[PDB]
């Protein structure tokens, strides 16, 4: 998927790898190689009105 991988402060659990928001959307994933808590926010969108 797409998004802006940023740093976060979520206190994950040892067995937890993925993440999810209130309603079915990945919000954070632990990096496989170097264990670290990231933040998945979708890339910038929006509506245009002329």
């Amino acid at each position: 998927g797409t998004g802006v991988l940023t740093e976060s402060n979520k206190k994950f659990l040892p067995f937890q790898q993925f993440g999810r928001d209130i309603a079915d959307t990945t919000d954070a994933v632990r990096d496989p190689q170097t264990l670290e808590i990231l933040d998945i926010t979708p890339c910038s969108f929006g509506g245009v009105s002329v």
Binding site: I22, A23, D24, T25, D27, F45, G47
Partner: protein, 433 residues
């Protein structure tokens, strides 16, 4: 088995009348939704989340993306019109006078308070502090955007403050032309003449009615704070919009005849000749799912539009004018109505006239003095047992029966219930002296 109340069988007699002797001014609250959250969706991102192959099929599937976006656009313009036809009914924004002595009535709880930065009345402060990644940002990432209203929370508070300024200072002549300065003691003195009670009651019992009004307004803040389910009519609108958005985002994880809901996994775990068979199931189910949201939004908007038109009629007939419609402006004889802003709605404070302390008397249709039947001109014939008096129809005020409050019509032969009293002609004592 539920009971419909207690038995209060009234003793209907042929010559028994009940005239009240005391008044009880009560301020009721009526809450009506005026607007809702202006929602807007994106067809491409919702149906095909970050899927270029899915987007290609959506264009060839039809132009259904334009009908839904145009339908939701009319809803957004509708909500801006609803807040424009109810709160915005006066051109000139009236301001409250510097002095706050309005005869003895304390409007400190309903007038805007300049101390707090929001510039809202203490009662409105309780309203906005009661009606309620997070859920809001989660819906945005799926296309469920919430457009901001045109009228801000400050402009709506200014529209309501202008109405309260014209209701106290101008009265009822600020929504039907230019505002006219009039004292508040003289304002309610003419609002009583619409319910039958003459103006010789407010001017006499001015301090008593002032204390009842000031005490009734204080109970409004207590009733809304003590009772948890008070602003429930406005929470139902918020909960319905929240449930509609929580259900529309829940159907995204529902397989409409497919192996999974992840559009990315379908293209990777299958092949294009086989993926096209199953990808048509989700693009049809999600498009039908979004169609149900627009359909339910149009039906729910009609329910709010009926409440917005009722609130517009209620704010024009109860606030800027006295309405003689029973039960329309609160339960009881309508006197005043003070509008107050609320999150997605308006809360009216209907000041009603509720009689109390009724007393039983004896009545007669007409009285006979010299053969001509004298009928009451504007009152009701009552009697305490020996003497007969003419009193008002909503407040006991014993008065002598002269020739100025009783007219004559016919003779005393056809009226069933005629009695024999003596009227006092106002010229006999003057001609004698």
């Amino acid at each position: 088995t539920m009971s419909l109340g207690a038995e209060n069988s009234v003793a209907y007699s042929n010559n028994s009348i009940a005239i009240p002797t005391n008044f009880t001014i009560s301020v009721t609250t009526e809450i009506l939704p005026v607007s809702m959250t202006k929602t807007s969706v994106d067809c491409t991102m919702y149906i095909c989340g970050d899927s270029t192959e899915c987007s290609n099929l959506l264009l060839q599937y039809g132009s259904f993306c334009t009908q839904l976006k145009r339908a939701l656009t009319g809803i957004a313009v509708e909500q801006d019109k609803n807040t424009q036809e109810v709160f915005a009914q006066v051109k000139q924004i009236y301001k409250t006078p510097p002095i706050k002595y309005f005869g003895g009535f304390n409007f400190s709880q309903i007038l805007p308070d300049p101390s707090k930065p929001s510039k809202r009345s203490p009662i409105e402060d309780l309203l906005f502090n009661k009606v309620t990644r997070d859920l809001i940002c989660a819906q945005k990432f799926k296309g469920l955007t919430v457009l901001p209203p045109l009228l801000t929370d400050e402009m709506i508070a200014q529209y309501t403050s202008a109405l309260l300024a014209g209701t106290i200072t101008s009265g009822w002549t600020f929504g039907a032309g230019p505002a006219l300065q009039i004292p508040f003691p003289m304002q309610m003195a003419y609002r009583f003449n619409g319910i039958g009670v003459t103006q010789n009651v407010l001017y006499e019992n001015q301090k008593l009615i002032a204390n009842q009004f000031n005490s009734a307004i204080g109970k409004i803040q207590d009733s809304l704070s003590s009772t948890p389910s008070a602003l429930g009519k406005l929470q139902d609108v918020v909960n319905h919009n929240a449930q509609a958005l929580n259900t529309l985002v829940k159907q995204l994880s529902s397989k409409f005849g497919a192996i999974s809901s992840v559009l990315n996994d379908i293209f990777s775990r299958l092949d294009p000749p086989e993926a096209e068979v199953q990808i048509d199931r989700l693009i049809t189910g999600r498009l039908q799912s979004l169609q149900t949201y627009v359909t339910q939004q149009l039906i729910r908007a009609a329910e709010i539009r009926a409440s917005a038109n009722l609130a517009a009629t209620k704010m024009s007939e109860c606030v800027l004018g006295q309405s003689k419609r029973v039960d329309f402006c609160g339960k009881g004889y309508h006197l005043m109505s003070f509008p107050q802003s609320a999150p997605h709605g308006v809360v009216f404070l209907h000041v009603t006239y509720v009689p109390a302390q009724e007393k039983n008397f004896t009545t007669a249709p007409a009285i006979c003095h010299d053969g001509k039947a004298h009928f009451p001109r504007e009152g009701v014939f009552v009697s305490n047992g020996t003497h007969w008096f003419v009193t008002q129809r909503n407040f006991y005020e014993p008065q002598i029966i002269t020739t100025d409050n009783t007219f004559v019509s016919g003779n005393c032969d056809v009226v069933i219930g005629i009695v024999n009293n003596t009227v006092y002609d106002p010229l006999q004592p003057e001609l004698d002296s």
